[PDB]
Design a protein around this ligand. Structure first.
Ligand SMILES: [Mn+3]
Ligand SMILES: [Mn+3]
Ligand SMILES: [Mn+3]
Ligand SMILES: [Mn+3]
Lengths: 205, 205, 205, 205
């Protein structure tokens, strides 16, 4: 069912900011595991769905509840990493080039400059006290205003919050290259952020 | 699909410990709402399941994640209240009579007496800092040992933790009769706890 | 130390929207309990602080961690209810009158109208799946933009999120008058919301 | 105030199960950061404590709430790693040798064998969906019974739950040696678990 997104650039294309070693593992092992976990969980839910249709018991309801956590976690892992690769690009393909259009105007109006929004995001990233993510979002419920939000583990942004830029703060995203020095990774990644994709997502809503 | 459990005793059967006013609302309004919410959520998941089979996209995955919370919450609300009514009984039907069999021996071995286990549970109930539950459980993974656990909101005990006695700590469970005096409710409810059902659940596993 | 905020209007001043019965209990019992809980927790932390200065052991650190939850919960309970009473007023004192100044302009720019912001807040309130709050906030980090956020239990808005209007979604806030019909309470409360105070808080930041 | 626990064995003493590279970083960088974070947070709380004594305002309460998270996280990080090093030992110092005394009897009575308890713990470790820990605990409230519990991030076991064996499941605990293969790390670590210390902690309570 759900599959790994097609490889766009080779693993080493984001060097020296993110290593090919990291990208190979992050994609072939970590992302694949969420793919497999999500497929398994949705399958298990379908089986329990049919079981509940036959006997709508509290005991059968309890096993549905047990599987929900795996749908959330692996579903989140699948979606978050898909977003992640799509908002990353080598400098040859426009990575690190500033956003354009309505997103660029919103950034300047709200934060004063790109650098200020980046600074805020880096603060949110360093403030993840465990595994998680930061997302630059467009909030559709308050007039399409920009904000930066943290999530933990593989929690994601849903509903009115549209993800524009996803940044992985899990230790596996940086440890082989940066080790404990996560701030250096958060600083470095903006050199390969695909702001064209972010602008596109701002417009698409 | 999922329906309200058949009424066993009339609403006023647990008086003076829990009022008929409370029981009517708790069953006909609160429990029914979880029933409806659970049916709606499982339906919505089935629709999204079919949508993912057609297009296994990250966008479609995100809406599956959004619905998971409602399955957990309403599923939990459905199951928890089912457990709740089944471990309650009027004194005429054996409510408040101490447990028997293997459960009775386990209680005495682990806690020294029924009163000590009740005291512990009441501490856990008063320690719920918001809406939630306390469960006296049998843990199947550590040799079938008794413990008391808290959950928040409509979170429940799954997997190796077998619920033996569920006690509702949501304010709607007591407010009309006891108001802020939750400790008086926690004290009073043991007069109508169905320990025969608890003993049965200990044995069934 | 921390004390209950001085009574401003009498308990029945918000009728028929919130009953005097509710307000008496909410203030004299619920709010007071958070006051007492917060004083106790900060005292206990001071004692443990001195103990750590004498012996900075992992065992002493563990008891500090245990007390943190009570500081958060009771501290939150104290602050949230203080905010709550201060953004409520009888219609005779301007309750239910629309906001003015920069807040009024921000509301119209972002949400189109007051009614739309209220609708959004009511959705967030009904979406609290347990005990909690909704807050209309000013976000100081994204250009002072308005948003509506949920918290659970006695969690609060800190740092860059400035609370403008706090609405209590705990069942004790409505149950005696509305019972299960929380939507009717969420609808009714806006008739006594102090939008002058909200405008003041928007400006003060 | 709080300091890094004195080094007992050299960084490479747990090889080939945990690398010296990992241990150097885990101790000198990760543990030190929690030490610094905990000292800073307790200092900040003392300053806010004095500020509240002067003005017990809701605004001052809000900043106390903000700092609580850092006390919990860094306090937990400090305590958890202290526990971690103390339940690890080279094979030359008794690492990997089975527990003795009352703990050994409890393990056999509850789980059937050491291998079964290890299997359960490894399941709990692999089930940490993010950063966290597994703890083999003695529960003082249910008759001193053994259990295995998960925590997330730097959350810890407090009160009646006595930590006997702490196992770090944060990716930084294994990534440089095992990368994504966390199950291999969970399997390998038992060769250097200090079960003598675990037996001692079981007895001390
Ligand atoms: Mn990742
Ligand atoms: Mn209930
Ligand atoms: Mn309240
Ligand atoms: Mn660690």
């Amino acid at each position: 069912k759900v599959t790994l997104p097609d490889l766009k650039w080779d693993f080493g294309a984001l060097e020296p900011y993110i290593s090919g070693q990291i990208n190979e593992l992050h994609y072939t092992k970590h992302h694949q595991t969420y793919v497999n976990g999500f497929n398994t969980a949705v399958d298990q839910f379908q089986e329990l769905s049919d079981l509940l249709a036959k006997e709508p018991s509290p005991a059968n309801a309890r096993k549905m509840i047990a599987i929900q956590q795996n749908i959330k976690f692996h579903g989140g892992g699948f979606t978050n990493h898909c977003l992640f690769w799509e908002n990353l690009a080598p400098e040859s393909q426009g990575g690190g080039e500033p956003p354009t259009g309505a997103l660029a105007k919103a950034i300047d109006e709200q934060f004063g400059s790109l650098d200020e929004l980046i600074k805020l995001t880096n603060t949110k990233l360093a403030g993840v006290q465990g595994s998680g993510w930061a997302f630059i979002v467009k909030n559709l419920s308050n007039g399409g205003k920009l904000d930066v939000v943290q999530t933990y583990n593989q929690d994601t942004v849903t509903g009115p919050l549209v993800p524009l830029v996803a940044i992985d703060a899990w230790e596996h995203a940086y440890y082989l290259q940066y080790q404990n020095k996560k701030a250096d990774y958060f600083k470095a990644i903006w050199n390969v952020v695909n702001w064209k994709e972010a602008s596109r997502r701002f417009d698409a809503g």
